[PDB]
Amino acid sequence: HPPSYVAHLASDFGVRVFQQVAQASKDRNVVFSPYGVASVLAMLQLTTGGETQQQIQAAMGFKIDDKGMAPALRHLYKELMGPWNKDEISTTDAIFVQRDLKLVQGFMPHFFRLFRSTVKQVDFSEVERARFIINDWVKTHTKGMISHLLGTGAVDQLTRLVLVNALYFNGQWKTPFPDSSTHRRLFHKSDGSTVSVPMMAQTNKFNYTEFTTPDGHYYDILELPYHGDTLSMFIAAPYEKEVPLSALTNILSAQLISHWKGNMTRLPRLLVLPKFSLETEVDLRKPLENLGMTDMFRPFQADFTSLSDQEPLHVALALQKVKIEVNESGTVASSSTAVIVSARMAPEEIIIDRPFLFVVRHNPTGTVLFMGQVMEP
Amino acid sequence: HPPSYVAHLASDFGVRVFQQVAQASKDRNVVFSPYGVASVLAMLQLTTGGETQQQIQAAMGFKIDDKGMAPALRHLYKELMGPWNKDEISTTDAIFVQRDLKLVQGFMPHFFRLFRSTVKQVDFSEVERARFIINDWVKTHTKGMISHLLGTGAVDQLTRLVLVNALYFNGQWKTPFPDSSTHRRLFHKSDGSTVSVPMMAQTNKFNYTEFTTPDGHYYDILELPYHGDTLSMFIAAPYEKEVPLSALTNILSAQLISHWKGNMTRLPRLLVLPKFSLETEVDLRKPLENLGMTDMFRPFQADFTSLSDQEPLHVALALQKVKIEVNESGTPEEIIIDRPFLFVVRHNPTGTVLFMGQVMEP
Structure with missing residues (x-):
């Protein structure tokens, strides 16, 4: 755990802090x-x-x-x-x-x-x-x-x-989301209520994997790389709409995140992700x-x-x-050269x-x- | 500007458009x-x-x-x-x-x-x-x-x-590639990385030629005809593995493509080509x-x-x-x-x- 232990411990502690934050704000953006x-x-x-x-x-x-x-x-x-x-x-x-x-x-x-x-x-x-x-x-x-x-x-x-x-933090993706594919779409809150928000869409081979919570619930983890592959964003959500995010939130851990990365496989998919700014x-x-x-x-x-x-x-x-801003490019000031809306057949x-x-x-x-x-x- | 011309001008404009597409997607399938x-x-x-x-x-x-x-x-x-x-x-x-x-x-x-x-x-x-x-x-x-x-x-x-x-587009070849010769094989990406993908293979007298880019890089052009010889697919790639595809892509033109066709010669070869679906x-x-x-x-x-x-x-x-679907049927050197x-x-x-x-x- 040669001096990289610190990054780990560091991260590990940060995650424990975050969990307390999340348990105090179940239902609020954090x-x-x-x-x-x-x-x-x-x-x-x-x-x-x-x-x-x-x-x-x-x-x-x-x-x-x-x-x-x-x-x-x-x-x-x-x-x-x-x-x-x-x-x-x-x-x-x-x-x-x-x-x-x-x-x-x-x-x-x-x-x-x-x-x-x-x-x-x-x-x-x-x-x-x-x-x-x-x-x-x-x-x-x-x-x-x-x-x-x-x-x-x-x-x-x-x-x-x-x-x-x-x-x-406002990262530039490895592969920017195409502007023309950003559209409105229903977002199901936890209330049961709904709201129509701009969501981005992209087809690509994505590092992806599916885990099970310690009590049997299935969740999907998708990895989205930033330019250079130094940093990446992991999106995690329960398979079943009924399962609340806390199911994942309460078992989170720095180690668990490394585990997601390790078991991922690049599979073709169409990804629809909400734009957001927290x-x-x-x-x-x-x-x-x-x-x-x-x-x-x-x-x-x-x-x-x-x-x-x-x-x-x-x-x-x-x-x-x-x-943290999560948009299509991560730079609209130097508007991308991006021309490809979709690069492949994406079934799933x-x-x-x-x-x-x-x-x-x-x-x-x-x-x-x-x-x-x-x-x- | 008269009419046999429209097909050409048309094709030529589309090629300029495609060049912009490729310049913006260097490294991606297109x-x-x-x-x-x-x-x-x-x-x-x-x-x-x-x-x-x-x-x-x-x-x-x-x-x-x-x-x-x-x-x-x-x-x-x-x-x-x-x-x-x-x-x-x-x-x-x-x-x-x-x-x-x-x-x-x-x-x-x-x-x-x-x-x-x-x-x-x-x-x-x-x-x-x-x-x-x-x-x-x-x-x-x-x-x-x-x-x-x-x-x-x-x-x-x-x-x-x-x-x-x-x-x-899914065309039927003039001479189908035989199924049993489709095998795995290493495809060398541009990364340097590698991948094993179903490649098809066929031996035949194929229209073939070789050109030089304006700065001296040799590239091979192979012509694969579709049933009836109305349409055909040209496969083009640099002689040297080190040369990137854009060396060809930036010099492309509708006229150039007519040139490849006109200088080709049917020569016996064993063609190994990756099956692909874009x-x-x-x-x-x-x-x-x-x-x-x-x-x-x-x-x-x-x-x-x-x-x-x-x-x-x-x-x-x-x-x-x-x-576009490119498969086996469509239904020495x-x-x-x-x-x-x-x-x-x-x-x-x-x-x-x-x-x-x-x-x-x-």
Whole structure:
């Protein structure tokens, strides 16, 4: 599990976080970033100590200080920030700390050595400025694609520590969906209600496979590659309309996703998938507490002694904000050359016209960059 | 421009169109119909005017209204709808216009005089019916062999004009390939990857020739005749495995294809050719814009004043859907086609290019 263990553990932890998010929003659209939560929490590990540090290490499965962990995360980061990503994915991590706090000696440089980033310093007593700083951080490192943060409203004058994670993603498919084949079509919600939404259609040999839940339900997993085959999007949905998405959601796992990839076969199919555009701001507290990280959020219980001695010190706010667009090209600014509407006879069809799960993965490392549930596109 | 010419100009325009298709799908299978697209665009000529009409005429090289052009296309059509075609080839053209539109007086009859068909009228406000109408048209004139159209997805309530062209082709060889010699065999993709696909084999004296691209690459052309010698399929591919198919594809022309035919010699060989079944639906807009026909697709620029006066009038959609089946029956020196090849189906009497395509993976 040679330093690629970190990508795995990382992903694995992110998925567990996502599950809590999904169980709290059954029926609502949710896009999340497993990779991102792990990354910002790994940074957070350095500022902690005591039982607070223990909960995070126990929940993540690793220690950011052990030989090879930090370097593997840096490597992983560099690997996704490569040349192949044509402005398709942006990601930031940021820990804001009250400016006056006296930090422990060696904290700053130790942090920088392992991440090549700094804990940000802000004057929380000046709250609108504080709030503006935090939002602007996010805006400037995600090319202005993330709408402003809404949870920062709880940032007051007693705020001493805030952490944020934000990512934007709009990939360019290996094979773009043809514009002319995008049409209206009924989407069956979970209500039993219906809505007519633009769905894209494409015929192609698709990596595909069918799994069974631990209690006998059949689900289909389709893999859609992005340009270059670095990243791909996995679409997963229950065979039977009656089965609710939670059937899949509750058994999800980073390992399970690798298993889907491994058993797939390229088969000709006509794919009908809804266009969709999700944005989700997640308040990380509940999900973190459900994973056992309770001390970090409680004042006077939280041990953040690796960052500072100033007594009251805890996470006042932990947010993740993600936006993911799924359209035909992934670039209408440089309108494709695409001319072929259909390239082959496609008998068997796959119509994603009921709530589905989507996974965006970095194939080389098996890192789950995004994971979401579309309940209504 | 007189009439034996129309088959040529027609074929030549279709080949330019196909070249745009292949340039945009380098590496993907593609079956196209040069004759098909010329025919439906020739029909479209009548509904246009202004600079829209000019772009079509400049790119096709002829005017459907000049003395003898229509008559020749009609003849050409009848000549391939003959008795010799034993349910091997089906083709349709169809221009669908919004029912409510007030058509200019004399448009309809002038159209029917020159084509012996009518512009179809549909209620585009009722979009699934519309889509159904367009699909079913194609389904009834192609003996049900063409899978439904996916490009009609863009037909909405504002659609006023759509054009389609669909062809099905499964010919019966002059000399069937024997079943028992069809075996598996490695086909070398362009990737470098490999695949095992049913290849057919036959020994015979085959019309064959060899040409050089304008930059020195040798390519072999093989001629496979269909029953009666009316039509034949030309198989073309580079001598050297390293040369990509586009080296041939970018220099192709209707004239070139007539040249291959004229320099061929019947020589005994053992031909090994992959069995293949292609279907491709093409969105003609890009290819047509690249050939200079940009106005017909733009709202409020497009001049379709010979069909009607109702202001917003333009081509919302232009599709071609083609399927071709190449099997054994249709019901010393070796030539092993085990790397991407180009195929051309030609009507020999007129030298019309009915089908043209590239098989990157069979």
